Design a protein around this ligand. Sequence first.
Ligand SMILES: CCCCCCCCCCCC(=O)O
Ligand SMILES: CCCCCCCCCCCC(=O)O
Lengths: 61, 61, 178, 252, 252, 277, 277
Amino acid sequence: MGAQVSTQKTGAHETIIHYTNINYYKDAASNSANRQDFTQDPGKFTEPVKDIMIKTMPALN
Amino acid sequence: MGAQVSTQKTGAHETIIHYTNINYYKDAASNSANRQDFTQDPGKFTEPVKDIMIKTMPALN
Amino acid sequence: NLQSMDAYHIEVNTGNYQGEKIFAFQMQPGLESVFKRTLMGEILNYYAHWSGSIKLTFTFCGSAMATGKLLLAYSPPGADVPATRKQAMLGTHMIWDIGLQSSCVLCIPWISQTHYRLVQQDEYTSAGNVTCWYQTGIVVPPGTPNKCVVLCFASACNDFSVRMLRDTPFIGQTALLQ
Amino acid sequence: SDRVRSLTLGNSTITTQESANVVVGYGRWPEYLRDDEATAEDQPTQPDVATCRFYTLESVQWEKNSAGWWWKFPEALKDMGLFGQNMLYHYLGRAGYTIHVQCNASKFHQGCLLVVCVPEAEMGCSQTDKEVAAMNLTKGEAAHKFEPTKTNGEHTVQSIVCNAGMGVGVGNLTIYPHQWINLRTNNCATIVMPYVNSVPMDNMFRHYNFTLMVIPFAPLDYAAQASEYVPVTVTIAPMCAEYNGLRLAYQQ
Amino acid sequence: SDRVRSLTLGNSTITTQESANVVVGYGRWPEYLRDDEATAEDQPTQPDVATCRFYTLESVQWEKNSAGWWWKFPEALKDMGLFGQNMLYHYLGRAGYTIHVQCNASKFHQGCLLVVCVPEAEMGCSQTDKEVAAMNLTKGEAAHKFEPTKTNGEHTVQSIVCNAGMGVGVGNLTIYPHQWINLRTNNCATIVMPYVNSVPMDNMFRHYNFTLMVIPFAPLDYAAQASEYVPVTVTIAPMCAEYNGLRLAYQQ
Amino acid sequence: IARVADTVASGPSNSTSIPALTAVETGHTSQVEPSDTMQTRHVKNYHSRSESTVENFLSRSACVYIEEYYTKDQDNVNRYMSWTINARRMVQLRRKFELFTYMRFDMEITFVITSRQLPGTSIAQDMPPLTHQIMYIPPGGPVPNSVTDFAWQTSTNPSIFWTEGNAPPRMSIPFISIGNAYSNFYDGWSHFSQNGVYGYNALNNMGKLYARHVNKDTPYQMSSTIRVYFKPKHIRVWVPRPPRLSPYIKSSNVNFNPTNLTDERSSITYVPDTIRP
Amino acid sequence: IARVADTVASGPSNSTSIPALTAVETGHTSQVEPSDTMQTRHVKNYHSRSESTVENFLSRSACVYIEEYYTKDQDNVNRYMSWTINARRMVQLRRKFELFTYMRFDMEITFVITSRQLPGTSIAQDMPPLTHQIMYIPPGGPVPNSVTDFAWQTSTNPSIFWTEGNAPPRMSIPFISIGNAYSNFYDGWSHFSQNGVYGYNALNNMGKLYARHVNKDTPYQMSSTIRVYFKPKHIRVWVPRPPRLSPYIKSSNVNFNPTNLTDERSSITYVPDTIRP
Ligand SMILES: CCCCCCCCCCCC(=O)O
Ligand SMILES: CCCCCCCCCCCC(=O)O
C-alpha cells in the first residue's frame, strides 16, 4: 500500500523505534494530527527590530 | 494486494497527502463513490450553436 | 405579478425620465427574491458558500425603430444605494446602446473581501446593489409603441463556484406523499 | 462593422452601435509627462483607474429652438469622484480625457450637432465694456447654453451662437478636434484629447484647459407623435492623470 | 550613532536624535497584495505618495495622573487628506502604516510610556450587561483615554488601565509590536506594522484593524520650575495602500 | 484539477471589439468575464468546483421512506411492512433527482430501524434483543400476507437479518433499470391507446420491500419504525431541467397548484437601507 | 529535532562586552543566557519542546457544548436539540483559542450522548436501545420545528445516526471559514455604519446543529444529554496575545469586570520561611 514509516517518540528504555501509517480516507481532513512538526522562529516576537542587535554590545550607542 | 494509491483533497495546512485503496468485493457496485471525477463541458448548454460565436464579435451581422 | 409574465417585464418609456431609477436590487444570488429562483440561484440554495462573477444580460424587446441608451451600474457594499445617476455612475457601470445587437452584458465582478460569501448573505458578506438609469432616453418614430419590455438574464461566469452542501429551503412537506 | 465600438476605462465601459470612427486630438494620444519635460521635482501621484474612468454629466435636452451648449474642463469635473478630490488636494494636474457625447433619435428624426473641443476657449463678455465672471464661464457639470440672439448680462458671456462667444465664425470651429452627430447616420461622437497647454502641468481650478461645445447646425425636427424628448448626454474620462504639489484641500 | 534616524514617506520627513532602533511588525515589512493571494478581480488603485505619507494626529498631554490613551486605525485617519478620501470612495482597503510616537522632556524629567499596536483590539463595555457604541471605541483623530479606576458609562469602554479594556493584563501587552519611551534614554518610538488580518483586504470604516495604545508604566514626574507641559504626539503613515470597489463616497 | 478560471489582467480599451454586445435570440449564453468589460488585475484563482460534481452532489444518504409495524397481533395493526420502492414520497431527495431527466448509477441502501414499547399501566417486561428481517421482492416474486408467510423463507430473494444495537444494516445494489438509464420523467402512457398510467409509474418498477420482526411475539404491544435511505454512487445524469417550483402533491404524478415565481417586494427599485449611522 | 539549546562552558571575564546591559525601549527581548553572566559548565541538553507545539497544545478533544432533550411530549420540554455552533460557551477551550488572534485547521468532532429515565413511582419499562440523530445545518438550510419535521430527511445536510451502547460517534471536518483563517477577535462591526453586531458574532457563522431521538416515543419520560467535543488538527495560528485575565461573562462579546492583575501578599519583600529546624 501507500505505507509511510516514520520515527516514534523516545521511550522509557532508550540510551525498531518506528511506526507505519496509511491514510484510508480521501480527504486530508481525515488524517491524524501533525504532532511531529517541530519548527521554530521566536525572532518574530523576541527580536522584531529593524537593526540587528548583537548581544555582547550596547543596545544604544 | 491490488492496492491503489491516490491523492487526497487539500487540507487546512497546505501551501504524505495521499491515501491507499483496495476493493474487497467482487461487484463494482460495492466500491465507494467516485468523488474525484472532475470533467466539464458547459458548451452543451451554454453554447449549443451550430456556428461558433467569437466573444469579441457581434452575435449577428 | 408573482404569477404572470409581467414579473419578468422591465418597462422603459419614451419621454423625459431623467433622475428616475428604472430598477434596482441587491446582489444576493441565492437570497435576493429576484435571483433566488433563477437557475443560478436555485442551485446556490443547495450550497452555503459561493464565489465568482455574474453575467447580467439585458435584452431590449422594443420595436426595431426604438432607440436609446441605458446606464447599468453596480455599486459595491459600503455606501447608500445610488439615489441619482451621478452616484450610480461613480461605480462599476456599463452604458448600453440599443441597436442591431439586442442584448448587452453587465458583468458584475467579484469584488469581495473574503474569498467566499454565504448564499444566506448577511450584512457582513454584503455584495452591493445594481441600479439602472436612463443614459439618454428612448426616442421613437410616429406610429410606434412608447413602452418597451427589457428582459434580464442571469448566469455564473467561468470563475464561479459553490462550496457548502446543504438542503434547499424551497421544498418541504407535512407527511408522506401518496 | 466599424459602426460598433466599445470603450473601457477603469470600472466603466461605453457601448455604441452607430459611431463614426474616433477622432484622436491633434494626432496624439494621452501620455504621462516624461522626465525630459518635467519641472515639478516631487514624485507625482497617478491614481490611474481611480480617476481615469468615465464620468457622466447632467444630460441636456435638444429642442427645435436649441442654439447650443458648452462645458469647461477640468473645472466641470471638480465634484466627480476621486478625480475632483485630487484637484482639491493638488496644486498641479495633467490629464488626457476621452469625450463621448451621446444622442440618439430615430430614422424619422433629423438634426446635426457639432461636438468640438476648443483649447484655451477664452470667451468674451455680453457688455464689451465690462468683464466676465467665472460663474458665467463654467458652473460645474451644469452646462451653459448658447442663444440664437445677442445677450445683455452685466458679466455674462456673449452667448450669441454665430460668434461662439469668441468673436469668430462658428463654421470655422472645425479646425479643432471634432465630430458631428448627424442623426440619420450617427448616434454619438468620441474625441480623445491629449494634454494641450504651453506648460507641462497647470492648476485645474484656475485654468480651463479646453471647452467642449455642442452646436447644432441642422435644427432638430420631426413629425407629430414622434418622441419630442431628445436628450444629449456628455461623458468624459480622464487619461494619464498626474498630480503634483500635495497640500490642504482647496475650499471652493 | 544609531540614536539618530530619518524617515521619509511621500512629501513628509521625520527626524530623531534619540530613538531606540525600529520595531518591524511581526518581522514583516508592508507589501502590496500578490496575485496568488488576491480575491478582488478589479484592478486596484495605488495613490502611493498621495496617501502613503506621515499624518500627524491631535497631540495629547501627559500628566502626573495620566492613565493612558488609545487610537483605532484606519478609522482614526478617515479625515486625513487623500488617504481618507479613498476610504470613502472604496469598499476595500489595505495598508501598512509606520507608527511614530513623539514625546520629549529633559534629563531632569522621568517617566516611561508603552507604545503598542494591538491587532483586533476588541474591547469590552463598562456595564458588562450592555454593549459598546462605535462612538466610544474610536472618535477620529481624537484620542480616547484610559482611567486609573473603573468606568460606569452605559455604552462606554471599560477604561480601567490594569485590564487595558480587554480583560487582560497590561504587563503582557509586550507580546504585540511595541517599544517604550523611557524619557531618560528615549525621545520617541517607531513601529512598522504590516497588514495583519485574516483576509486579503477589508472595509476601513466597518473594521478597526489595530489599536494603538500608549500606556505609562512610570508616572511622569519632575521638580519645581521644571516644564509641566509634556505633550505626546502621534504620527502615522500608510504603506502600500491599495483600494478596490470604487463607488459613491460613503456618508459618515 | 477541477480548478476555476483565473482572471487575466486587463487594461484600457477603445476598439471595435464588442464582447459586451450580443444576441440571446441565438440561444447562446454570453461567455463574457470581468476582464472584458473593465480593467482587471491578474488573479491566480485556486478555487475548485470539486463539490459541484454530480457525484458529490447526489452521493449522500437521504431518507426515501418510513413505515411502522407492530409485534403483537392486537387490533388492526400491521405486523409487517410493505413498500413499492421509489423515491417520490420524500420531497427532499425527489427534488434533487428531478433536476435531471435521466439517471444511471449504483446505490448504497442503509436502514435505520428503531423500536419502542407502547404506553400502558402495567407493562413490565424483559424482552430479548429484537431481530428484524428486510426482504426485497423484485416484480413478480411471491408476496407474504402475514408475518409467518412462506415467502419469508428468502430462498432466492435478497434479505437482511439485523438485531437491534448493532450498526444500521447496509448493502449496495447495481443499476437495475431495464433501460439504459433511470427515468425521472416519462411524458407518455403505459398503454398504446394513450391511456392507463401516465408518467413515472407507467414504466418504473423496482419491485417491493418487506420487513418484520423475526421474534415470535412480545408480552405487551411494541412497534418498530424502519427508515430507508438511498445514496447513489458511480453517478451519471442527462438532460438538466428547471427545479421544482410548486410543492409536491401526489407521489404518482407531477400535479401542482399555481405557485408564485418568487417572493414579492415593494417595487422594482426597492432595496433596503442597511446603512444608518 | 525539537531539542533545546545546550549551555556552552564559560570561564572568567573582563572585557568591554556587555551582554547583560541592554535597552528594552527597542522592544527587543534580551537573548542572554547563563553562560553570558557567569561561569558555566558544558551541558548536553536533550530536553525537547515537542509538547509545546501548537499542534500538541490545541489537538485535544475539549467539550464545547451540552444540551438535554426529552423523549415524551409532556409539558414544555424540548424533544430535540438546537445549537448555533461556536466555542465561546466553554471557558476552558475558549481561553486557549483566544491565545491567538487567527486560526486555521481541520477538526475532529466527537459526541458523547447519554440517556436516563426520569424519577417516578411506577416506571417499569422495557425500551429497546435508543437511536439518536445529529444533523448539521449550514447557514441558510431549513431548520426543523419538531422531532418529526421534514428537515430530518437529511437529503444533503451531513447527519449521523448513532445507537446507545456503541462507541461515541465521530467525524472530521475541513477548514470551513470563508476567510483565509478563523478569527477569534474582530474589532469591527457587521454594518458599514459602524453598528449592529460587534465582534465575533459579527462575522463567524458555522451554522447550527440539531439532535433528537429517532425513536417514536417512550412509555415514561426519558431525557438524553449530548456533549459536543472539538479537537483541532493540522493547526496553524497567528498573532499571539495576552491570555484572558477577567472571567468570561457573555459568550457573544468580551465584556468583563475589573479583575486583579494577580494575587496579593504581605509586601514586595515577603518570602515565606520554609526552613525551620
Ligand atoms: C434490494 C433493494 C432494491 C431497491 C431498488 C431501488 C432502486 C431505486 C431506483 C430509483 C429510480 C429513480 O429514482 O428514478
Ligand atoms: C458538521 C459539524 C460542523 C461544525 C463546524 C464547527 C466549526 C468550528 C469553528 C470554530 C471557529 C473559532 O473557534 O474561531
